[PDB]
Subunit: 436 residues, 4 copies
Amino acid sequence: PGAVSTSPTQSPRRVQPKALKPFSDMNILLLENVNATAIKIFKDQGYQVEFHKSSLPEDELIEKIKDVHAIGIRSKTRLTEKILQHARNLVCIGCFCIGTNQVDLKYAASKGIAVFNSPFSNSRSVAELVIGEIISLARQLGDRSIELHTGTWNKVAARCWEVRGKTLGIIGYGHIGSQLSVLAEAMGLHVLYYDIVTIMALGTARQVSTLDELLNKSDFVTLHVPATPETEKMLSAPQFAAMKDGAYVINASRGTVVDIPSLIQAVKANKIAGAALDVYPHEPAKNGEGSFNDELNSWTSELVSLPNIILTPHIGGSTEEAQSSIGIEVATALSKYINEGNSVGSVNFPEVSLKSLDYDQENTVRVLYIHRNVPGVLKTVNDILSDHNIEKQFSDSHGEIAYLMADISSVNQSEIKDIYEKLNQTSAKVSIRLLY
Amino acid sequence: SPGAVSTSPTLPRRVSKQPKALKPFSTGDMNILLLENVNATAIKIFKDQGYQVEFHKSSLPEDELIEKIKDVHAIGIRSKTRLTEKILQHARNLVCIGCFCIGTNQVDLKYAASKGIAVFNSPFSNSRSVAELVIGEIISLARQLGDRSIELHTGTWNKVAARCWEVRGKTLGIIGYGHIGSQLSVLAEAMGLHVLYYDIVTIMALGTARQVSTLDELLNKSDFVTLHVPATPETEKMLSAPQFAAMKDGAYVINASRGTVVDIPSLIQAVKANKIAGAALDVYPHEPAKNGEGSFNDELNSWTSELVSLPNIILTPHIGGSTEEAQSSIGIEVATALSKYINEGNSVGSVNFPEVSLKSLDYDQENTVRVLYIHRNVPGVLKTVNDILSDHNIEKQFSDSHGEIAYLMADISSVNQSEIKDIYEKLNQTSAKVSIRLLY
Amino acid sequence: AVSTSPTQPRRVSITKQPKALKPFSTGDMNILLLENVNATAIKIFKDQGYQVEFHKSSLPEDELIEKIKDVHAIGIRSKTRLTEKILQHARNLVCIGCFCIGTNQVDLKYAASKGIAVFNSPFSNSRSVAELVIGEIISLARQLGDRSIELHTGTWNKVAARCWEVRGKTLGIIGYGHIGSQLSVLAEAMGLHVLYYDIVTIMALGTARQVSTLDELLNKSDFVTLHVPATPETEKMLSAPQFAAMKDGAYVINASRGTVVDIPSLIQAVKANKIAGAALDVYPHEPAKNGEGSFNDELNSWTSELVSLPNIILTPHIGGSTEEAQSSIGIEVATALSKYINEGNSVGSVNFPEVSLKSLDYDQENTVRVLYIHRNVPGVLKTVNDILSDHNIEKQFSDSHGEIAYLMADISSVNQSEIKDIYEKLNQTSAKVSIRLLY
Amino acid sequence: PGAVSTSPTRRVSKQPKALKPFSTGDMNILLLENVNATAIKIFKDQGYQVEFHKSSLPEDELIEKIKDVHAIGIRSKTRLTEKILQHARNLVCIGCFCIGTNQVDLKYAASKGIAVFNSPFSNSRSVAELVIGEIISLARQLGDRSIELHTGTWNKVAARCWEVRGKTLGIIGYGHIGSQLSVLAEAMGLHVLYYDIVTIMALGTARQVSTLDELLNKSDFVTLHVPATPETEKMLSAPQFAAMKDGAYVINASRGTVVDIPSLIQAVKANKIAGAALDVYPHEPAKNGEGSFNDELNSWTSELVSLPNIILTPHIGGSTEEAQSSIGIEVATALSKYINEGNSVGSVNFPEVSLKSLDYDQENTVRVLYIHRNVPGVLKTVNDILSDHNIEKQFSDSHGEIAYLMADISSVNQSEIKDIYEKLNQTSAKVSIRLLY
Ligand SMILES: NC(=O)c1ccc[n+]([C@@H]2O[C@H](COP(=O)([O-])OP(=O)(O)OC[C@H]3O[C@@H](n4cnc5c(N)ncnc54)[C@H](O)[C@@H]3O)[C@@H](O)[C@H]2O)c1
Ligand SMILES: NC(=O)c1ccc[n+]([C@@H]2O[C@H](COP(=O)([O-])OP(=O)(O)OC[C@H]3O[C@@H](n4cnc5c(N)ncnc54)[C@H](O)[C@@H]3O)[C@@H](O)[C@H]2O)c1
Ligand SMILES: NC(=O)c1ccc[n+]([C@@H]2O[C@H](COP(=O)([O-])OP(=O)(O)OC[C@H]3O[C@@H](n4cnc5c(N)ncnc54)[C@H](O)[C@@H]3O)[C@@H](O)[C@H]2O)c1
Ligand SMILES: NC(=O)c1ccc[n+]([C@@H]2O[C@H](COP(=O)([O-])OP(=O)(O)OC[C@H]3O[C@@H](n4cnc5c(N)ncnc54)[C@H](O)[C@@H]3O)[C@@H](O)[C@H]2O)c1
């Protein structure tokens, strides 16, 4: 009838390293008003920081970047071949943001320049926004507050709903989708999610096989997808046709993923009761007045005349929490690459690291040798280092570039200069630093 | 020794005799009048009882109401329809009044009670709708959503993260830890907020909230301050200049309680001085009585012009309980309450009447009759009634007094169709009688 | 369409302080407590003004009859039998406290016919039984008892074979009542899947699942525990066919009733290597006192065979035998008597009509409470309400339990003079069983 | 004035390449001391040939058996000395299916390029559950109750019998076991305090206490989850028992040495300690046996076993089917990844070295596993020998006098393999070389 047998095998934080210095104080340039957390991390390392609140014109940048060891940018400052080619001293680039398209990664890598970003530091800020907007759409808060500001009193309960017992449809169950799932359940929503992949539910959310089943059974539909050919305009006339009468659409994902004119048709036809958009096919480049208009997007005027539409200026990760933790994530990443040669989490460089050295390891030196990925190079380097015990050593390749880290013992101030000069003279060399 | 090991200090729902369906000795079918667009849930409950329902979406003029209420057994109103002696005095048949709302002031309770007319309301069925609103507004204030959406609608793009905060790790100060305060406490903890609460009573925390001894400790340590208090002399203008002075630089004020409890001009000063970073108000010292355009202006409240000038103020027209869920559960709560008073004489939860009920009778208790005798609260009346019913075993009996009115319910066995008519006529002829119904 | 959802803190009570009522013709109240009732009961009774006589033992029928002549309330446990023979001499007895679950040691029907209200504590033992079952699940899983018996005789036997970690295992709970449900939550916390069978549909706590047949439970369970009442349908409800339906190497725990398991079948199943272990707290026949040669083949024919077996925990009805349980029995039952003696509250009584009224405000000077227990016949309310008719009855509640009935009335504007009159008149009525006045 | 301030701050996923050794005929595994069937299944599913025994082996038959063996699994009883490891031509790695490694000459094994693995933490849940069972059992005197009725005594007693809910558990050592116990104990409704020589972040709502003396003062049950160090030696003795509550309880499933049994016995005799559960004693029998636990082994045995409400267990804290089976998986997996990929992470005698697996489609990539003497010049030689191929990547680490290089090299055809093996095999510093292709 059965037997008692072995259960299936299941499936805290607690409280001395050597401070390494380069043979060459380092100079950091921070643009586009990076958070003060980044600034404090860099100053506490001894580094000299130059801080600006704006991007710089191509002219002043080329002048500034000549003598700089690390630069922090956001989405606005373009680092092209044109401007990176004058960067004699540049060790690494910090992108205090998710995007890296504003940097010529291929070129940066070929000069031995490591690039870091913060891809996931914004998840919580977007999830909270969507909760706020579910409630705000449910209750038509925006409309109520606009009315009373113009002096109109319109106390309405009709089609104004409580969120408890309603269905949230999450399209894309990723970093943000999943954090949202848990908040939504805590606010008493049933969570369905469609994804092109099978994913393990958090809490008591249920994965649905087709988009059509989600749109059919959902009161609120929210999008948390990347920009791909398949996500392009993936919500359009036929999707809105498949949704419940008086259902709600929220998009804080990508400007392209929803067909705004179809949305506008659906809202006009009383099929969709509300929408919140944080992202649009075309967005201003700077902040300012009459930026959001029919020159930018043809339907801007038509949308601004609809009831119960929340429109936001791409502010999903626009919190002090998000900016400060981007500051820490990226300043830490640079700080460990400059101080230890740690390239883990870089988007353009081979990923390489070694355990820190004890305070007690006098006269150990760390070789950071970026080089062309061809046969013969380790032969040369390990020949040059032959007079010293290599405690340990790690090399990895990323296409046509490669990165060796080596720890060598019994090196006096004299022998360092010798080893630098020899490694500097090698055929395959792209960049060499010694940490001492 | 450092003490001794000694004694520590100290069910789920189960599906578990059918009740007897009790008919009035009134041959006439019951007539329900529902005004002011009571929810369809109420209508359904009444029709399924057999009752005849007349439904209006508006109040009625005093003329048509007096005509209509002559032959009505139960009336449902909301806050608009005033039931005064003037109009209740013509109500021959009226058993009970339903207030499908929190307020009972629209009704002359004292007068209604003296005619044996029981009044019921729904005090608490709006709690969840208010708690959800406050969560929405904490986030909306934290992120300046309203301002962002107003900007982009006029064509201004202003992407700002300065003065924008993730609610996680912030402190919610709840003033009044009642029905709404407590439901808010749980939602706030789930959204990752620390909860403090001040209350003039000691109350057991839900989740991991902590009660604080003084208002001033709450104001000092809170990022968002929300009010969930009644309108009393002590709550009148209890948030003013000195309270805002005690609050954190860049803290937020939410008032969805009573329009008297906050001094709007002091808050306007505090917002102007960059001491308060945002506010959401659902309630005001003076509110329009109808919905309309240019209702919310300086004739009604002097500061309107300045208030609506400010950044990051959410203004709402008393919409805290304005949901379909809230209205529908008001429908069930109040229609059920009337239905049990009409069918069983249950007066528990009534606001103008003694609170009296008895266990239902089993389906198989043939020839048991229930006496519902509303009467003047004076000596001798139980003596009379229990004399009139001495030829019968009283299975059980409950009488309570509320001022000058009192309410006897009695279950009596071994009564045939003959003896019912006798008992009605006798009780109907008594000196203290205000109202008698028999259920069989 | 988007449509309407389906419909879905204790505080210091600032009330007007209640009025403390005293008895009228009574000088003082005498409580007799037998069978070593907890000190919590003693404290509650002394704080009420009552005079307490405390014994650690039952009393011989001789000394008891002498003692209960002049007694207002008696507290017993399971041993002291209160028969017609001994209750017939009880002139003054207002109420009986059973500081335990059982009320069979009392002649309830007789007690009721003399107007004597009986109270018990049915559910104050739940947590003590649930914890015991957790301890025993682990102890059986790991064969602790056997290991410790071995080493005490000097034998070292490190064994891992068919010793298990409870996490991942299935607890089958038969009877999802007060104990069943508390056990459910502890079991899930110790990482067990919980199934439960019950003859009623019941809402699961946590992530337990109710199963439609007993046989599904027995099939899918590693540990089967019973928390069921003693009924004709629970009698030997685990027998050969149930053990046959259980997993090879599954475990049986009975801390419910002595009759619910067939021990000869259990013994067979353990002998046939079908059942790997059992814990019994209850047996069809139990000693009456504690003693050294009590648990033997005279008491139960299979004892020598049962005690022969490996990995069987035998315990002497200690399911509820904790300091916590005894002390909270003390509070529950002493409170219940205290409120019946002081306020006439009969709610939770096992032999009387359930009747109470809201307390009176402190400032209701000259309001008196009539407690009139009487024969459930026509005309008695007529008489009483006649006797009271010179006074406003603020409120009044009468309920009937077969042939006995209980009226409580609050009456205003009564001076010390009119009290004596009203007592004497109610005392003289034909239907009267007992009358007290509180003022 | 104050100021609002910044807060503090499941998916299925390129198949791997299955790498074969260059000069192997079949892999031979020897498993001793009745290793769990989970290990056996993992090895058979790799293709390996498995020989399984339920007992340790005599030194004679072992030396014969280990000549031709690629991997051996032992537990604590088998002793792998220089004497017996010196005959092991083909031995790649040793599996300790247990927490102990002292039964192995680690230093010697390392110097021959023999990697040793264990399962240090596989037992944590089994020990935590035992302590829960024993807290309840001591609280209620279950053992005594069951011993009484078995002798025919009926003794229904509630005195000094307690419910655990509302009682205080003092955990000494908030490690792998301490921390799992913390969560179970809270769920059973105990307050948890813990002392540790390190500051550690509480799970749930447990509170770390500064001194041992505060723990002993405020605790109803004291349980020990520490390693064997000079500081833990007899750390519970007369003065600690003096500091504990009248009628408190002591549980030791840590190490045989950490409690002074004489003082415990005095404290129990004086009615200061109401009960104790011991799983570990300073001296323990060597086999299971019927007269083993006595005054020859520990002078206090006859006195200890006299006492009421003392649970005595035979080191059964990690004696469950679950624990043995997950030791099976942990250690068989560890060997399997070392044999198949050269992964040495979690090894106790060898350097810790690993690389990402290779994609299925990387034909003619070869992995060099070169164990060697930790001296200058060796990487120079090896990287010279390999210089006619692109090194995709390469990792070398040293552990004292031994060191371990892993390299991935591309564009290697069936011919060039034999050349590279022979050259690496001929180098002065070489201790062991395998090629995977
Ligand atoms: N509004 C903002 O300011 C802001 C800020 C941060 C992130 N985002 C954006 O939001 C999106 C989601 O963010 P994330 O970090 O959680 O992403 P993610 O990488 O964690 O997950 C994306 C999910 O989408 C799923 N997916 C991909 N294509 C799909 C399709 N066609 N249909 C359904 N599911 C599909 C993937 O399986 C994955 O689960 C991204 O585009 C991200 O850049 C916006
Ligand atoms: N916005 C709306 O549409 C709407 C809807 C429903 C309720 N409300 C109002 O909001 C309030 C909350 O209603 P509720 O059901 O939660 O009330 P409640 O009676 O359940 O709780 C009120 C709490 O306030 C506390 N309290 C009273 N005076 C206090 C004071 N001076 N300071 C601190 N604590 C004090 C009480 O102890 C109690 O805990 C009421 O005034 C109610 O009328 C508004
Ligand atoms: N061992 C002890 O010292 C001790 C102490 C307390 C209680 N108990 C006994 O344990 C039992 C459980 O106690 P409780 O307070 O939880 O009782 P309870 O009344 O709360 O629960 C009993 C449950 O059994 C269910 N049930 C009844 N007949 C059934 C049947 N034949 N099959 C399955 N389910 C059935 C009922 O529906 C109910 O859910 C009782 O017999 C009680 O006297 C023993
Ligand atoms: N009974 C058994 O069969 C069995 C099974 C497994 C483990 N164990 C033993 O149990 C112990 C705990 O195992 P674990 O995995 O939790 O170990 P662990 O290393 O994870 O934790 C030990 C903890 O003790 C602390 N500690 C060390 N010295 C201390 C001192 N003097 N005072 C207080 N705290 C101190 C450490 O800080 C650490 O947190 C070990 O000794 C282990 O061998 C026994």
